[PDB]
Paper text:
Ubiquitin-conjugating enzymes (E2) play a crucial role in the attachment of ubiquitin to proteins. A rearrangement of the Ubc6/Ube2J2 active site enhances the reactivity of the E2-Ub thioester, facilitating attack by weaker nucleophiles. Moreover, a conserved histidine in Ubc6/Ube2J2 activates a substrate serine by general base catalysis.
To uncover structural determinants of noncanonical E2 activity, we determined two structures of the UBC domain of yeast Ubc6 by X-ray crystallography to resolutions of 1.21 and 1.33 Å, which were virtually identical (RMSD 0.394 Å). First, the loop connecting the four-stranded β-sheet and the active site, which harbors the HPN motif in canonical E2s, is shorter, and contains a conserved GRF motif (called GRF loop). A hydrogen bonding network centered on Arg79 of the GRF motif connects these two segments with each other, the crossover helix α2 and the active site cysteine. On top of the active site Cys87 lays an aromatic ring (Tyr93), engaged in a π–cation interaction with Arg85, which itself forms a salt bridge with Asp92. A conserved histidine (His94) points towards the active site Cys87, consistent with a role in the enzymatic mechanism of the ubiquitin transfer reaction.
Numbering used by the authors: 1 to 169
Write the structure that this text describes.
Amino acid sequence: MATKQAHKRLTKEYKLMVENPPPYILARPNEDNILEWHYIITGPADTPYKGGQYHGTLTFPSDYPYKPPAIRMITPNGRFKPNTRLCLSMSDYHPDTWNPGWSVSTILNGLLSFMTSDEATTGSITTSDHQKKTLARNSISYNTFQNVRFKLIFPEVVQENVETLEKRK
């Protein structure tokens, strides 16, 4: 069981996202484990990610709020190696400078802003703009058929994706 402190904080962080949803970012705790969050980043305009659907996870440790989450991205994307901890300023590569007061939306906006930059970090990969665009186009099919956890966590989005894939055809 998560500590009562962590459970209270992370519940509040979800409510804050419901009340003020950050553009391009949907995220929520697992319904049976408040420490394991899943997110979907929608690729923004003005990037080669435009229209992509990028599933990943923010795994808060048992000692949250005093230790950062592990950040991973599951959907192939051309910027981050899939299923790999990512070295970001607000991540578990940086426990010494962790600020407990960072909100989940702040952490995720840090991931999105890093994604759309070209800075290398542990977990990043090198692809072309064309490869990123192909991965963005194919991300919805990927998450529907090649991503076992996506359907378990986001069944309502799988249902949307099926309709999107049909409308594309």
